[PDB]
């Protein structure tokens, strides 16, 4: 049974080096190209490069040339992807895949990726508590903006958890600055605005941050 | 050098047929072989078409690739749609030794009626403005399928810089939510009559607007 098995998830810091692996079994490793593909979170597939283990022939995407090294060790049937100095932007899922097909130099020959590794997640990432701003109402909707924190997670409750119906807490944006922000909104009886008090409770444990923000018209 | 452009999303009910296009931006599509990949959420991709119209062993004959030179496009047809076909699909070709992927298309196999987004837009708070910052918050929820596009307007002109938008995420009712944030200086905020968050879903655009007052 042909199998490509990749190494486990990696958590690193920028400036560090890293080498992840893709081991092939169930076939002659040196006879088939291995492709590497990157996929940043929530984004599409990007071709990184390709190596033929038999003679170490290697090609890189122009956008990854000089940024990363692709290699192979015949003796243990393993392909590698490695960086000299990781950047936060290297945070992605990385897949290897075998180029199978019919390696004949005539019109019957063909090539396609017929087996894939399971992927290796590489996360390359100091802590900061958020600023919390009331989003005042103007059926009524009111909320809290949780601005510029790091890292995840952040918890939001309303009225110390007494208020849960109508609450929508949104997943965080990861900003180009590298900081996270999220918002929580609750829809309440517009007639209750003058009667009921609304407080969002924001907790960011990594920074020992606890903010209670009253939200009023 | 070229790009491959795909629709952001397509959908149909079970049993129906869907087509996903892949348009080559420059050069003829027939000049280089096109492959297609299926990627189910959280899983590795699998190849579903190679060399334009060849079906790998093990792939159901419901999947078929073709080339249309007249529109400079490749297409993936998925026939007799099944719930398990729900996935992102990527086309791929070659640019002088380098592999080029299309941006991906989210295929949704409809499991409930299409639902338009509920949108709430908040202006920057007094508190933020006093802290010399300004953020407009556009919250988008209960849409299905899970794909929207968000554009911002300063008055009626497009804003590009300062916009950051989440990918859609599934809610507990199996509809989707997203959010978009527009960063501004307090000066910019006061300098226009209004700002607008425009959310387009299944060809239909939901808009919200706030104003300094």
């Amino acid at each position: 049974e042909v199998q490509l098995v990749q190494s486990g998830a990696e958590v690193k810091k920028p400036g560090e080096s890293l080498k992840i692996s893709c081991k092939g079994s169930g076939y002659r490793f040196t006879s088939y190209w291995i492709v590497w593909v990157r996929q940043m979170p929530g984004k599409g597939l990007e071709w990184m490069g390709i190596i033929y283990p038999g003679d170490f022939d290697t090609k890189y995407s122009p956008s990854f040339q000089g940024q990363v090294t692709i290699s192979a060790d015949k003796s243990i049937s393993t392909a590698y992807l490695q960086w000299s100095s990781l950047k936060a932007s290297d945070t992605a899922m990385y897949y290897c895949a075998r180029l199978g097909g019919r390696y004949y130099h005539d019109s019957s020959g063909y090539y396609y990726l017929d087996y894939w590794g399971q992927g290796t997640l590489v996360t390359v990432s100091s802590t900061k508590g958020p600023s919390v701003f009331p989003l005042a109402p103007s059926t009524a909707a009111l909320g809290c903006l949780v601005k510029d924190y790091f890292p995840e997670p952040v918890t939001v409750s309303w009225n110390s958890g007494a208020l849960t119906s109508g609450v929508h807490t949104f997943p965080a944006v990861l900003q180009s600055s590298g900081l996270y922000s999220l918002s929580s909104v609750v829809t309440v009886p517009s007639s209750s605005l003058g009667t009921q008090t609304y407080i969002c409770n924001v907790n960011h444990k990594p920074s020992n941050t606890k903010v209670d923000k009253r939200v009023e018209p | 050098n070229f790009m491959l452009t795909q629709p952001h999303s397509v959908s149909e009910s079970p049993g129906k047929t869907v087509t996903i296009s892949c348009t080559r931006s420059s050069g003829s599509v027939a000049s280089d072989y096109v492959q297609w990949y299926q990627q189910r959420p959280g899983s590795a991709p699998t190849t579903v078409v190679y060399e334009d119209n060849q079906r790998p062993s093990g792939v159901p004959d419901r999947f078929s690739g073709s080339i249309d030179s007249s529109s400079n496009s490749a297409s993936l047809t998925i026939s007799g749609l099944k719930t398990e076909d729900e996935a992102d699909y990527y086309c791929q070709s070659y640019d002088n030794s380098s592999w080029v992927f299309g941006g991906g298309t989210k295929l949704t196999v409809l499991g409930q009626p299409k639902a338009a987004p509920s949108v709430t837009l908040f202006p920057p708070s007094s508190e933020e403005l006093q802290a010399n910052k300004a953020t407009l918050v556009c919250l988008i929820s209960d849409f299905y399928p899970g794909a929207v596009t968000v554009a911002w307007k300063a008055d009626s002109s497009p804003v590009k810089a300062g916009v950051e938008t989440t990918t859609p995420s599934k809610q507990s009712n199996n509809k989707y939510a997203a959010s978009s944030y527009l960063s501004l200086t307090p000066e910019q905020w006061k300098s226009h009559r209004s700002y607008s968050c425009q959310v387009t879903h299944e060809g239909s655009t939901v808009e919200k607007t706030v104003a300094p007052t």
């Binding site: 002659r28 040196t30 038999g54 003679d55 390696y103 130099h105 063909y110 090539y111 | 072989y33 070659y94």
Partner: peptide, 15 residues
């Protein structure tokens, strides 16, 4: 010709 291109890309005869 598309075939010629992929052979140029991929064809290898292993030792």
């Amino acid at each position: 010709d598309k075939k010629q291109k992929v052979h140029a890309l991929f064809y290898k005869l292993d030792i």
